[PDB]
Design a protein around this nucleic acid. Structure first.
Ligand code: NA
Ligand code: NA
Length: 327
DNA sequence: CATCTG
DNA sequence: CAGATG
């Protein structure tokens, strides 16, 4: 946790690089287990050879660990942090909508900066454009003080459209968190479920409302069950407008809300543990449901849930306020 | 995983 | 349709 920290950290730089700059998914994946294992490892790795001893730990990595232990640095790591082509990619990529693939294309065409990009807005697609248009707002955290205002609106608009809608803003927003990166809304309606064959309107009508009153400003992607947009809290009395915020809205069959809600609320740490506990208790749990575990090895059949309560109960556990869903 | 692009 | 992005 801090005993093999640099090692794990250099490994991660390396891994990351493989994958983003190079196309090195194998290699990339290689750095990864290595960091995972040394990361678990209980002692101070005093040498390459010692590391080697571990699985995932091969000769190359061992070499690397040596040089790093030997001297506060790594030449390759040094050579990579410099390199412009590499840097560009880590950069372009900050654009919402530009992944590595594209980052690479562009670089080879010479776009390496915000400016470049602006000049070449023709080469970018809708998501990418938006992404560029709000590069700034996008990287700005979201003070819960705004979150509360957002939430407030979203929920009232849903209410107006249908009394039957059930919205939830999961996220750390939900776990307590002072700020958040984006807004996640979980959505359902009674007349929508597992069997119930679709109802696209279900999600489109709401989206529509939000843009009606202008809460939603742009559309990243809009499918029948998932909507990726951009929104903004109405600028008050002109002098202080708000940054543009990323927002997501998703339709869920009523028959698997709570699992989603639970699930999406995190933290990943809480998940896992709740997850492991369920398993003991003779259960299985995932994004959409909880299933009683058979003995033949495994086994199915959706346990029926009406609140986050039903879930815990099942696994016989202490209902957790979302605040304490930390770990 | 669901959506988009081309 | 494969392949990219989130
Ligand atoms: Na990006
Ligand atoms: Na292939």
């Amino acid at each position: 946790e801090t005993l093999n920290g640099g090692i794990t950290d250099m490994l991660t730089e390396l891994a990351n690089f493989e994958k983003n700059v190079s196309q090195a998914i194998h290699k990339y994946n290689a750095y990864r287990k290595a960091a995972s294992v040394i990361a678990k490892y209980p002692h101070k790795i005093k040498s390459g050879a010692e590391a080697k001893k571990l699985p995932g730990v091969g000769t190359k990595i061992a070499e690397k660990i040596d040089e790093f232990l030997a001297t506060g640095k790594l030449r390759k790591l040094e050579k990579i942090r410099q390199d412009d082509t590499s840097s560009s990619i880590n950069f372009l990529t900050r654009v919402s909508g530009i992944g590595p693939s594209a980052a690479r294309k562009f670089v080879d065409e010479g776009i390496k900066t915000l400016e470049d990009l602006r000049k070449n807005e023709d080469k970018l697609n809708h998501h990418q454009r938006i992404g560029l248009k709000y590069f700034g707002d996008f990287e700005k955290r979201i003070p819960r003080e705004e979150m509360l205002q957002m939430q407030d609106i979203v929920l009232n608009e849903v209410k107006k459209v249908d009394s039957e809608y059930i919205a939830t803003v999961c996220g750390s927003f939900r776990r307590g968190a002072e700020s958040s990166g984006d807004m996640d809304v979980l959505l359902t309606h009674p007349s929508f479920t597992s069997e119930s064959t679709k109802q696209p309107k279900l999600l489109h009508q709401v989206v529509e409302q939000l843009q009606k009153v202008h809460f939603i400003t742009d559309t990243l992607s809009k499918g029948e069950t998932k909507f990726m947009g951009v929104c903004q809290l109405p600028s008050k009395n002109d002098e202080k407008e708000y940054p543009h915020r990323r927002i997501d809205i998703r339709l869920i069959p009523k028959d698997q809300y709570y699992c989603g809600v639970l699930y999406f609320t995190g933290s990943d740490i809480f998940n896992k543990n709740m997850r492991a506990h369920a398993l003991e208790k003779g259960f299985t749990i995932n994004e959409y449901t909880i299933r009683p575990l058979g003995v033949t090895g495994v086994a199915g059949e959706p346990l029926p849930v009406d609140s986050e309560k039903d879930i815990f109960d099942y696994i016989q556990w202490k209902y957790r306020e979302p605040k304490d869903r930390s770990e």
